[PDB]
Write a protein that binds this ligand. Sequence first.
Ligand SMILES: *[C@@H]1O[C@H](CO)[C@@H](O[C@@H]2O[C@H](CO)[C@@H](O)[C@H](O)[C@H]2NC(C)=O)[C@H](O)[C@H]1NC(C)=O
Ligand SMILES: *[C@@H]1O[C@H](CO)[C@@H](O[C@@H]2O[C@H](CO)[C@@H](O)[C@H](O)[C@H]2NC(C)=O)[C@H](O)[C@H]1NC(C)=O
Ligand SMILES: *[C@@H]1O[C@H](CO)[C@@H](O[C@@H]2O[C@H](CO)[C@@H](O)[C@H](O)[C@H]2NC(C)=O)[C@H](O)[C@H]1NC(C)=O
Ligand code: NAG
Ligand code: NAG
Ligand code: NAG
Lengths: 321, 321, 321, 170, 170, 170
Amino acid sequence: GDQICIGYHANNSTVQVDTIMEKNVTVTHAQDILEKTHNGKLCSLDGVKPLILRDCSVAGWLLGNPMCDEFINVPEWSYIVEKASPANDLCYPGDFNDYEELKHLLSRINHFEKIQIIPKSSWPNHEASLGVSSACPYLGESSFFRNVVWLIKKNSSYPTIKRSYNNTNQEDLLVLWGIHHPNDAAEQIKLYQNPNTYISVGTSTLNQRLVPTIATRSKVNGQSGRMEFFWTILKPNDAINFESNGNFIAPEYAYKIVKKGDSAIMKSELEYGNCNTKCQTPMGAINSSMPFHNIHPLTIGECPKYVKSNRLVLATGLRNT
Amino acid sequence: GDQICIGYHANNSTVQVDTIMEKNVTVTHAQDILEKTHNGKLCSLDGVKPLILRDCSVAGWLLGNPMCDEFINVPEWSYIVEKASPANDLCYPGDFNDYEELKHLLSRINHFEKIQIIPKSSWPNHEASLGVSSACPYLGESSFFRNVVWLIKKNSSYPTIKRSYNNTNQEDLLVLWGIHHPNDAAEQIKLYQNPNTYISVGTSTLNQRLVPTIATRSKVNGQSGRMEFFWTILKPNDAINFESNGNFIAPEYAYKIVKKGDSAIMKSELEYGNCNTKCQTPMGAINSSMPFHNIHPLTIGECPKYVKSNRLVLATGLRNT
Amino acid sequence: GDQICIGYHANNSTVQVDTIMEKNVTVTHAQDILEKTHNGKLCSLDGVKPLILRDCSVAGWLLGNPMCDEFINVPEWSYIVEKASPANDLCYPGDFNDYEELKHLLSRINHFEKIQIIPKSSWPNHEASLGVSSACPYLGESSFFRNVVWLIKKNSSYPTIKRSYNNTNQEDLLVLWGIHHPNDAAEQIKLYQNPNTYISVGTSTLNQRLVPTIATRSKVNGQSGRMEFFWTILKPNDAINFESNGNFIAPEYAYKIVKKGDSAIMKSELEYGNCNTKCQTPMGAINSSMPFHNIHPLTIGECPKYVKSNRLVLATGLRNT
Amino acid sequence: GLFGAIAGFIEGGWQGMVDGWYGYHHSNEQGSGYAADKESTQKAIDGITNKVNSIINKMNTQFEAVGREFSNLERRIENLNKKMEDGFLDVWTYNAELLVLMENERTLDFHDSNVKNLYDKVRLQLRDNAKELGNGCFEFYHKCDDECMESVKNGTYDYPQYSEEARLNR
Amino acid sequence: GLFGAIAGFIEGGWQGMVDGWYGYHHSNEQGSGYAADKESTQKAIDGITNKVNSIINKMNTQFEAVGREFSNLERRIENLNKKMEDGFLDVWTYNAELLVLMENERTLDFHDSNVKNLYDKVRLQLRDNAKELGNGCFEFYHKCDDECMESVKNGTYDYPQYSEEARLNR
Amino acid sequence: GLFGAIAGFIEGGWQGMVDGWYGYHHSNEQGSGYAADKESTQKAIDGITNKVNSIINKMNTQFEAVGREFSNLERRIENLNKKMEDGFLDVWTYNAELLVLMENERTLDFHDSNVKNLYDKVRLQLRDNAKELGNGCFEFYHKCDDECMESVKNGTYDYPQYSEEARLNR
Ligand SMILES: *[C@@H]1O[C@H](CO)[C@@H](O[C@@H]2O[C@H](CO)[C@@H](O)[C@H](O)[C@H]2NC(C)=O)[C@H](O)[C@H]1NC(C)=O
Ligand SMILES: *[C@@H]1O[C@H](CO)[C@@H](O[C@@H]2O[C@H](CO)[C@@H](O)[C@H](O)[C@H]2NC(C)=O)[C@H](O)[C@H]1NC(C)=O
Ligand SMILES: *[C@@H]1O[C@H](CO)[C@@H](O[C@@H]2O[C@H](CO)[C@@H](O)[C@H](O)[C@H]2NC(C)=O)[C@H](O)[C@H]1NC(C)=O
Ligand SMILES: *[C@@H]1O[C@H](CO)[C@@H](O)[C@H](O)[C@H]1NC(C)=O
Ligand SMILES: *[C@@H]1O[C@H](CO)[C@@H](O)[C@H](O)[C@H]1NC(C)=O
Ligand SMILES: *[C@@H]1O[C@H](CO)[C@@H](O)[C@H](O)[C@H]1NC(C)=O
């Protein structure tokens, strides 16, 4: 008697998958869908190199901390990389007003072009170079943030400043300026002559009046005084007007916003990897046709979807005998 | 030999549905569950007409921008409709303090009743009608926000104002007032006489002291000066007290909060449709027994649940031969 | 002819479960997975008693409202319990600066140790005990917050205060101080002599200058004046420096942060239950091997996952005949 | 099909069976014609109606977006607010599309299961008094009455009656 | 049922079968009585226990709400915070109710599948040495020993033994 | 298995059946050997490929976390932001693990269903011209041609041919 049988496939495959009712089920064919590996470098993102801030904060960079001269002129970036606790931030102690809101605006910027808006040499009624602090040393001598000017009285007087700058560029300008808070009223007069001082600033949308608050503070980087910095975005064909009779830290250089697009500020201890990638995480780049990865949730680029799983494996075959 | 057969249904229906393993499966009976259509009007919501702000912002309306006289007295609304960028906002340039927090409080309000709290004629020691700016023209002459009073010195002097208002109503009052920031110190004295001025304001929960900040600003609507507006909610049987020797933009009219309930501030380019609805979106109203719709996520009323799908169709029948 | 049958189980069980296609299906064995009960007490959390604030707010406690002497010295807690609207908050009317941010920092604190940082007796050039208000009565006499000192002029004068405190402890210190806003300029001089006054405060990270704003305010607790309170965290080996010629409400006692860990500030009308628990909700504690509960979403401890269901029951058996 | 009845060993559906979803087509000396099996067809209807409702009243608890407004110095929370609402929108969208997709597939095999169950109900009754062509049909080794036919449909078909004519008719 | 065994061609469950879920009831000259089929019954138990655990340890990652407080000038974010937490609460609620609902339904048909599988295991062994009443029972064209019965349950039932008495007993 | 074919009444899979997933092994006088059933095997492949894609393109809409930074006086919203993003991360993680888990289980029973469907396709064709050992095999009461074998696989097997030799060979 001739015989016919209905039968199925089996092989020497050992990969397991889970189901609701049963885990570690050995299946004849599976598909792993989780990417679990990376290169461990910070790579150019589709041919665009990131801006890697080394030991400088974003504040250190935009104000021109003398320890941050590597970023005096930065090329277009794909994304920016900043350490958890960069050593070089505000060399002279103080605060940066609405700092996080500025870092947020950066995630949306791809390129600046530094320009000189108020020359340091254009201050004939004051001292423009004097200017400096041991809290901000450069090559063993007293220095200061390079993008702003710490103006001090001249020949024993500080005439009231009325200065305006008109943005005659095509692009928005990031403008930065500040105020110095002295530790006593006798330091005040030593520095600015005028004991009662202010800084007014105005544009089409801005209207601020600063008064230096004097207090007795702990020393930070050897200083009891403080610098407080402010910024705004100046639209093309708008002007900024300044007025101060003391404590004014004037802008010298500003930033043309030449390129806007998709960016990010990535927190990573790593530095440039000299490679290319289409998907980068803080830990290293990913190159994968996988639809999921479990490397890190804050990535940049054309990335697989992040899950927190150890393993994700799709059974495609049948139970294996 | 007699014969019996087990068989199933089939017909000339052509509607397809998807499944996990197979898409475009023609089924004998399906149920579409996605509403994909609307009327394209902004309709009364269950017999209550929306307040459609035309070309005025919420700021334009509550301050009484002269371009906004259509809203001098507004009936109860279901919801409010405001354009993306209304042309009429702050005619005299400036800012509205905690504006978004006020617009949020509106989403919860159904009706105001404007009342006169401080008559314009009750200012014998100052000039109450003088008052006006080319930045705020009405019918080709200089005008100003109608709900507040720009008080100027009288016969060359500005006596200090101590004014109080007690809310003797059953309801909460929305009260609005302001301060003028001049461009120079010579404009200051021209307008208010007193070179050093303040505005103090207090209630059971409020305690503010305003000082006009003078700066040199770009011209907006032809003005380098600025108006800054403030508001509060005055509870029944509480009073508000004012004190100023300059730069005070006094309240004249306030708003009784007569009806509170469910509301919303809808952003739409559309205007009144002359219809009724139980569910409205920024694009038009929906009338549907459907459990899902894909029109717009910010709707108001008894609405189907919003999904982003193109099509949602439930197979109810069997495969069709 | 001998006979064999294939059959299944059935019994006199009546518990129903739902499925997609059928609800109230009587099944032979089910597993309820929803915990629906609690004890109704606020219990120690694994042997650690909560701090139950009775009729005092967190503000009432940390400032030392005289009505809040039960909390003059509080033991370590697991969590803190505060009523919806505690009757004892700010006895003298006013505000507590960044209050919610402080309550947030508390959710992360398990224990304070009050310490005296500036003795009330160490104010030889001013009046340290005078000091008091009818708004803050204790046992029928005028009193004041116990953790701060309302300093008033002495023998008709208020010399400028320059006081510093250095945190020589191992732990962070919560420090609290304030400013008094008087109702008139004549009360100002009566109290502090100096008509123009300030309060400057500085640390390694703080730099503030307070000016008392005078306004005419409604009476609250019988007072038209206001107290405004401020706080900071002082790191070990940092100092705080004060400077004021008026309106200064000086710190006396501060708080050592002795224990940090997991905590919470629970809003509940209940009070101590004299029991122990591993999972507490605002309504009462839970003791359950159940993987879900529906009591309240804001719980503390080793808790089942909160769902909003009435019933969750897993069919484990087969249909019951 | 997973149960292999629809588009399976019953390769085609009946245009002429308009009464219900599944059912019968007898053919004896007294005439033929389609009859729906009302018990299985009503079982299937109870089920599908409950499934629609279920789906709808499970999406009753669904996120309802609200409009909030932020100033130009509030960009971070405006962004967080946007991401937060977009997120709930994608979640509940995935949920509806994936539930419809899974219950659609389940719905078909249900109909497949029902035709098969029905085909087995007859089969288990007729035993050897009928032939199994295997095409969805059963041929009786005896003759069947229009009232014997309904007896198989009803579930009462009497085996110890024709038990003779069928056994001796082979 | 989808497999049509429970509440199907086996119209009723056994009160007296207390040993396990599914099983047997022999009846020969040496006495009758219920025996559970321990292999299918333990297969089903392994499965359901793993399913409960699965469900529980998939809801381990579930949103845990935290209390935050906002001032009266923080209404927008207080609202965003509320909506945000309510939202995660509804999502994870839908998730549990919908998973219990779907695995409940799956659980039953599993039991249905198991009884059917068991009923087919016997059936495929006895071949023509038994009659199929179609009601859940098999009648042997031969006599069956209490040790021949257990042999069908065990899966060893010897077909080339009674292959004679059954074939000649028709 | 739920359909009881794989690891069921066909207790073992074929190492030597490398052509496809399910299929045949004939054995007559002209030689034996494995042949895949390309129609069921391609049905199964169409299905599984579509299922993978489905799963992937349903997780296309998935939350993508963004980095935001807050000052030390923004702790409440920094916390809300953290909880909010962790939450969407756990939700979409549950979603992928639970979908893979449920479609994995569904995938197997699909293969089980397919082998059974295939085993029933032959069975319903051969009727009484073959024996059913019940082990996955059918023995012909007649002799089968290598071109008669393919005729059963094809779905054309001619019953009114061997209808004689089988009936008279018992
Ligand atoms: C900045 O400079 C521009 C160009 O000089 C000024 O432009 C005004 O309006 C249009 C803009 O396209 C110009 O064509 C006009 O010539 C300008 N008006 C005047 C009166 O010069 C712009 O106004 C300047 N910005 C400020 C704040 O002064
Ligand atoms: C506003 O006016 C009301 C009514 O005159 C004042 O009411 C106080 O307390 C109760 C409130 O019901 C009144 O019956 C008393 O007569 C009022 N007290 C006094 C001393 O008049 C309320 O105090 C006024 N508000 C303010 C801020 O002055
Ligand atoms: C607070 O007191 C401490 C201890 O006296 C001061 O400590 C400084 O630096 C180290 C810290 O370990 C000490 O060993 C030094 O002796 C201290 N420096 C000086 C110059 O005394 C700390 O500086 C004090 N804080 C403030 C703000 O003055
Ligand atoms: C991954 O990158 C490596 C290195 O360039 C390359 O060789 C490989 O082909 C890439 N694979 C994919 C899938 O992109
Ligand atoms: C929809 O509105 C139209 C116009 O009033 C009405 O005729 C129709 O009956 C309505 N249908 C439903 C379902 O509300
Ligand atoms: C619940 O607590 C009660 C009271 O202590 C105790 O008797 C019981 O054993 C506890 N049960 C569980 C499951 O913890």
